[PDB]
Amino acid sequence: MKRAVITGLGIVSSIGNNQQEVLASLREGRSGITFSQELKDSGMRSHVWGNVKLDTTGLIDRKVVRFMSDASIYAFLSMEQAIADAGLSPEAYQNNPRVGLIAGSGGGSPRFQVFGADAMRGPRGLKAVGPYVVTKAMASGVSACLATPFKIHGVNYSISSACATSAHCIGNAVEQIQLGKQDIVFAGGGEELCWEMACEFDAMGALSTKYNDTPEKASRTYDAHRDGFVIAGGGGMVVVEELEHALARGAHIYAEIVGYGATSDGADMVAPSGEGAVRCMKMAMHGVDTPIDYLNSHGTSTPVGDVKELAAIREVFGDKSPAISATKAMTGHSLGAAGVQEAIYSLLMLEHGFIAPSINIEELDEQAAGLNIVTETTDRELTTVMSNSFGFGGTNATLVMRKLKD
Amino acid sequence: MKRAVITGLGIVSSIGNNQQEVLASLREGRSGITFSQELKDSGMRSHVWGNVKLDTTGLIDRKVVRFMSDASIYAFLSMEQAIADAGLSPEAYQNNPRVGLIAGSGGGSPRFQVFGADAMRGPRGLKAVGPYVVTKAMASGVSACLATPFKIHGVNYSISSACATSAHCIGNAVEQIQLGKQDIVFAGGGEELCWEMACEFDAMGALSTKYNDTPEKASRTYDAHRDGFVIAGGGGMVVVEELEHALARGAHIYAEIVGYGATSDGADMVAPSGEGAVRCMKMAMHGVDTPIDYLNSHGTSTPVGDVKELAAIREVFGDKSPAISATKAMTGHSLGAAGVQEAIYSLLMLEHGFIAPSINIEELDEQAAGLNIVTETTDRELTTVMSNSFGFGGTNATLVMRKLKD
């Protein structure tokens, strides 16, 4: 019954430590990919990544950060940004049963997982491991480490679904409002960046390895010469709020979440089926009387993945193909954080009336012909935008965000 | 106002590889805890665990199990059981957009996360890692590895919330039914058992260490001399179905999920606040006018935890305190799988009309005086039951189930 709107946002990414820096990188088509000595020293073939250029030292209370892994740190910082940007203060969101938090990561924390095991196998055993590994390594790290410090009393858990993680978190936050269970739910996610996790994707042959010489060119979605995605880290958080509650406090509304699709391929364990994406996007558009002006694709810069989604988009729109661009060409694939970060990039485009350019397309892919793939920053009054997230295991999420009518 | 009921269950636990085996253990007060040479050799202080007594080799198609970690294997097997128990044919649940899956684990797969790191640092590097580590180590492994094989086309993601994990999965499934989004949702979870993850808890002082010589006596919820929980592994899965859909196909209905609570402490990172648990139980009892005949407590056998929950129970029911037992005294703490497995123990008790005993109470804690803690198998006609799951990070979940008329 209730309607859900976004009244605040926060982000820590490879292209910016806040919405202002991110906004700048987007309009400039700036890349956040750099060379990683860490990735190379570990023995990996991929030597590039989208790291967060930020010294988080002292940004979080000692007693709070002690239980956190990088995924939680990034998300926590993003939640602080979202809270302020939303105009909310402790007395309104803390110790409030009507306020919740749904945020997760794609891989929890392989770094502290490996750290624990390594320390344990040392001569110090349990003493070397320390009593803080559990909250850093568990899959619910991102929600646990934020809900406690921020005095959250409402819902509190993490949803995980690979590349769609933070997208489902947002969707589930919407469901909480529609059900009348919560007035506000902070939704988002975070993902650390480390060789410990990245080597898993490399050994799987999913990471780019032919552009370690030119980092900024590795992520080239839709480019006939693409050879895998560039792994990234970071966080993002949005304030999902019930409409009347937002209007009552004079909140600043970025947009309304008019659509939320969640489906499953039930086909391949690693590659997309397309059939699932089609149903997902259509589910998100069901009921929306306005057309999609911009579509922030999943496009991770992979041979099959890129083309599969485009084929799914054709099936859904046909001759009504909206503007399309893969921001991952700039940011990289932050995995669990991608969902909320990309949703934010879309909100920034909707809020500032512009479309981010799909960079590094030196030679468009034949199977991408007949579509409107924007490769240059173009100014335009967007009204309804769409964001897709398709992760391993055939899990699909689609969000449709539209401006509010005055 | 859709109603959700349970029409099938499946389980792989320390006390049984199917509902018949588990039924027997519950009635007999049989312990599923054994001595673990693995834990001892790892350098841990806790040398006991609730292990699955079953060789899973060859039970799952080679091409399917190749992507799975133990959490997924246990959950997968549990799901096969739930499907058969619910009487669902392949064409009744496969390739069906109205059929989904919501299942997760508390820690993904620390073993394979460590394996990948160990292998990567070896003389083979990437080659030793292999292309199956991602689907085994990621937090969403349990939903990803099941949705694909079972051809699920509906919702597909994992919920993570430590000890409450599979409980939230069930609650979220109920939400999908109430929202009219799905007719059937398989809900549950799995958790591997390994020193890699276990040492983390031991290093936190959360595991029992004074009863390694008498494994079956280590887990003793409410006993004055309790000293931590006994870690365990396993899986569980239930079929959450919309009432009309189940009735039309003549399904066997165990009970209706008449209440679902989900709250947050927003206080301590590893200790329960109690205040959050009170709200969670009250939320699950909203609209439930039938009395609680039996309460399956979270009671992990920890000094502070056990009594915190009893206090919360006293505040909720006052002088209307229901019969109580902590099945963890027999089974150990399966973490991510505890929610669904205990919901299953609760459903067996309700289906068969008996209350399993809260074993190993040689000296009842003084703060439990006045309560109705059942220490011996008692036959009785139950109608409404409650099962609590409170995980680290201050995340709470409560489920209330009730028998349907005639």
Ligand SMILES: [N+]
């Ligand atoms: N996206």
Ligand SMILES: [N+]
């Ligand atoms: N329980």
